[PDB]
Amino acid sequence: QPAHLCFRSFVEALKVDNDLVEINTPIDPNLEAAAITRRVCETNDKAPLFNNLIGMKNGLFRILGAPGSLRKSSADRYGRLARHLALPPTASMREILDKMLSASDMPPIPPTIVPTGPCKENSLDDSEFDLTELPVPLIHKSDGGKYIQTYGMHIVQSPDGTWTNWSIARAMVHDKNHLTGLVIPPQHIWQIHQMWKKEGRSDVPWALAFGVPPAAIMASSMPIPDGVTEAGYVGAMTGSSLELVKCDTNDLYVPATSEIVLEGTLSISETGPEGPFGEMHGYIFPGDTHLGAKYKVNRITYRNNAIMPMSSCGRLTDETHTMSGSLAAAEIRKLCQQNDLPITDAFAPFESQVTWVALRVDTEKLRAMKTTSEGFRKRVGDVVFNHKAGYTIHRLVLVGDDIDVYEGKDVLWAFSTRCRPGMDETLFEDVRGFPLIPYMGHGNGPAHRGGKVVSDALMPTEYTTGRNWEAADFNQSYPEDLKQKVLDNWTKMGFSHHHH
Amino acid sequence: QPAHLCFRSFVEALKVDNDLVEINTPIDPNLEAAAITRRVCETNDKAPLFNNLIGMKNGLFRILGAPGSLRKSSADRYGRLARHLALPPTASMREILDKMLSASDMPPIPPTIVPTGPCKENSLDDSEFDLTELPVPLIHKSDGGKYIQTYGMHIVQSPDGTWTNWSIARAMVHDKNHLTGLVIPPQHIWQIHQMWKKEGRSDVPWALAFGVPPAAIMASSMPIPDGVTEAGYVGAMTGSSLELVKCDTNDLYVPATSEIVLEGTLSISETGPEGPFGEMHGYIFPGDTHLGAKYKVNRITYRNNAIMPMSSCGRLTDETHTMSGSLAAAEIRKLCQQNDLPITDAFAPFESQVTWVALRVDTEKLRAMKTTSEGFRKRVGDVVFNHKAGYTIHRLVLVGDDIDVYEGKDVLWAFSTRCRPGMDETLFEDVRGFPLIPYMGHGNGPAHRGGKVVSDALMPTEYTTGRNWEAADFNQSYPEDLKQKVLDNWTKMGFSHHHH
Numbered sequence A, B: 001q002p003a004h005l006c007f008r009s010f011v012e013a014l015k016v017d018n019d020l021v022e023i024n025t026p027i028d029p030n031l032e033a034a035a036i037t038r039r040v041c042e043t044n045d046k047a048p049l050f051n052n053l054i055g056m057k058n059g060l061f062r063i064l065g066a067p068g069s070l071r072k073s074s075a076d077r078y079g080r081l082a083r084h085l086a087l088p089p090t091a092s093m094r095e096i097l098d099k100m101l102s103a104s105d106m107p108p109i110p111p112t113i114v115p116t117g118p119c120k121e122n123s124l125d126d127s128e129f130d131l132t133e134l135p136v137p138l139i140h141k142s143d144g145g146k147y148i149q150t151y152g153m154h155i156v157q158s159p160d161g162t163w164t165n166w167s168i169a170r171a172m173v174h175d176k177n178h179l180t181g182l183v184i185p186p187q188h189i190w191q192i193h194q195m196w197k198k199e200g201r202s203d204v205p206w207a208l209a210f211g212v213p214p215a216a217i218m219a220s221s222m223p224i225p226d227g228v229t230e231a232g233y234v235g236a237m238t239g240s241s242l243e244l245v246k247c248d249t250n251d252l253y254v255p256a257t258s259e260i261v262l263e264g265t266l267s268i269s270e271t272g273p274e275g276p277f278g279e280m281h282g283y284i285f286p287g288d289t290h291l292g293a294k295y296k297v298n299r300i301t302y303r304n305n306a307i308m309p310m311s312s313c314g315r316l317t318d319e320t321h322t323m324s325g326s327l328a329a330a331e332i333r334k335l336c337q338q339n340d341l342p343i344t345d346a347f348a349p350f351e352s353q354v355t356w357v358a359l360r361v362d363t364e365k366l367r368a369m370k371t372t373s374e375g376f377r378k379r380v381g382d383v384v385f386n387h388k389a390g391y392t393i394h395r396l397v398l399v400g401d402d403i404d405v406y407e408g409k410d411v412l413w414a415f416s417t418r419c420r421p422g423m424d425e426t427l428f429e430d431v432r433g434f435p436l437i438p439y440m441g442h443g444n445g446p447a448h449r450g451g452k453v454v455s456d457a458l459m460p461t462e463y464t465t466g467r468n469w470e471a472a473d474f475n476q477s478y479p480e481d482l483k484q485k486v487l488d489n490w491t492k493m494g495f496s497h498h499h500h
Ligand SMILES: Cc1cc2c3c(c1C)C(C)(C)C[C@@H](O)N3c1c(nc(O)[nH]c1=O)N2C[C@H](O)[C@H](O)[C@H](O)COP(=O)(O)O
Pocket: A149, A150, A151, A165, A166, A167, A168, A169, A170, A171, A182, A183, A184, A186, A187, A188, A189, A220, A221, A222, A223, A224, A279, A280, A311, A313, A319, A320, A323, A324
């Protein structure tokens, strides 16, 4: 089964790429697995596969850390992401994002129901498992629980059956048969939860599948539109209908090759302690005391020799940055284009802790609009910051065609030299804010509102007659024939490989 | 003569450090020398010494490019700067800046007049030189002239004789015996020029010395206070009185070992075309048509086999960033401390194109002030943006004690996650602005006023009870004994030198 369609095959692919370290000696899920993984993420090292996890019993479980993190080399920097999607390991960010957007104007390919799959190789009922007895990791030393759920997909369906959402949202063990987790607006798990709470008749049927098809975990991390069933979007993107099996205790469907499946309910009435957690922006606030949603687990099914993927998230660079940030940027690019805004590219610079998105403007089209910075800033901000795809993003940086938004150095150069603080910016105080950013939830103002800005790093003539500068760099301030001579004589003169 | 006190010795020191490439084949001053130098600066390669410059006659001149640029290795990244100052090549930025500030509370050591020096080995009078006939570089293809002056020091003295200023300001060849250059407020060359213009009796006696003592070119690049003679500050910093010789045609004094000396006058009445020039922020605006100050050259003296240093400035990283940015930051640190502000460190992040300064706060002292963000931001901005040392800086970022301001990644992390746009900032529109920044001089607003901001990246409890987070990183989210175990077993498990 191909790597992008089967997590077990994906692990093999990383091994074959020389992008995996198999640790076969005992490793403690209390901090040690996550510490190794954190070190991997901070240094762009190989993904760790913990085959011998202290507390693993009867097949539950091994851990794969850093499933979507960066490789050291520039040439295959995003190779782990490419392996989620059947792309060459040398794929660029543009190509990865374009793959993730490709299904947006294709007919969905709905999933195929099959009678069984590897996820049914083992089962534990309501009398046979205890979630406190599994080797669930403590990921950061001040975390408020053991975060079993950092890289599985929650499966919930609208009461009317018409929309089945797949998404990543964190969750930790509360007791032997419950989790608590984040379920917050405007996220689709929250939107669907609210539909069940308004109906008021029952708890939400739920499943959480770990080690799902890599192409599915990518879509689970992306803000595809309201009402769109991720399974059919992944089908269209991949050209293949995903094979799903029914849950044993409810009528939801899970990927046939899921490593581990939890089946149960997301309560419409109960809460319990959740967090704190070392989060995507790089912080934990020890002792924060929040209430979260509460999930009841009724059944576990799993593959022989099941593998749990884990994101040891925090400071750069991990799945929260590579997947949640980039995929939000991708959706923002499309949103802007669908609102007739002349945006070619979008990326959330890692340097911004994926709190900014840089928007590359087609300045030929901008000139034909005969508009101004103030007007255009407002239009862009209104589109993005009033939409769910803009939720996590607090600063939009508008740049002209010379800037490669996938290159953070160039975004920072343009921002720092082309956007006059105050005058070239528009603040947005009456939009939803992202409380996880420290300056929001732990800051001076409302946790849930405002704190957003459009920063215009377009220069004035980019609105009118065209770019009126050349860069003072090697590329732009010397003619072609001189540049090539300098390069050709570089090592001869006594100065100092692409793959590496 | 030691490297920090003699430019010729400094060149030898770079050779001995394996930090020099001697090019002995012909190189064109029309773009080629500068293109090589630009490539060096963009890649942190060895400094180029052009020993065979097309158009060099009768000893004028060789070129040293990239005299104050970065080395590739982390361990001796700032080694070329350290060689300006008798510091070990492994010196940190903090140590370099502390050396440059050390003379601020020492008695000056005035210079020593000697009867002759190497700068008198050759001379050309008013009938023997033509500045258009020298191998003056064209540094960027759209420059409005050949910029002879990118790394020499202008010498001007107050009418009353009490203050002799040394500073870098650019200048280009206007004709056989004149230069034009930037002379702009609030710079000390401008302040002194204004004193002569108010007296109204004569043009300003002037000299321009190239290849001066490295410790002197450092001070020439730093905004030491009004009225302070750089020569005596350099004397105090180095512990040695600098040896100066009198000019032949005026009563100014130049360093005895200067490579090349121009003697003449800076007009109090005349101007001529100046620029455009590929500038520190990374841009040139071809055809800009500005008038600049006009200098008349009456005499040239020079060393046998004279070497002209050259800065091929523009995009990262060159002397404008390493010296002008960092040295402004240093002065800002001191200014803040002298205004009883609890600042420990200051640095202009290269990522900001040295338009930001990050200010590290002693948050114990901040807490004892019992103040608020709004108040403290205003106080810091008022001190810095109303002073000459703040001229070139448009954004101040306040950070707490956990941030190393010499590490741009960490400044960017703190800015992006701890400063809420708008609410945690104060804009300053009624302060002098730096017109060279594109968003100022080529932007939407007044070229010379405003566009400044204090961005407070202190978190709320940093004002009150203390930091209330831990970072979600390897360093902070795992105990010491676990971290050391992970490091000790890193290569054993199968994961991947300080000098490299
Ligand atoms: C890739 C990735 C994404 C997310 C998360 C993580 C990873 C690895 C955690 C490590 C578990 C950390 C956690 O903070 N986390 C997370 C989360 N969204 C939430 O509502 N709640 C969460 O706790 N997203 C983001 C969401 O996955 C996306 O916003 C997605 O768009 C949602 O899907 P949908 O609502 O659009 O269907």
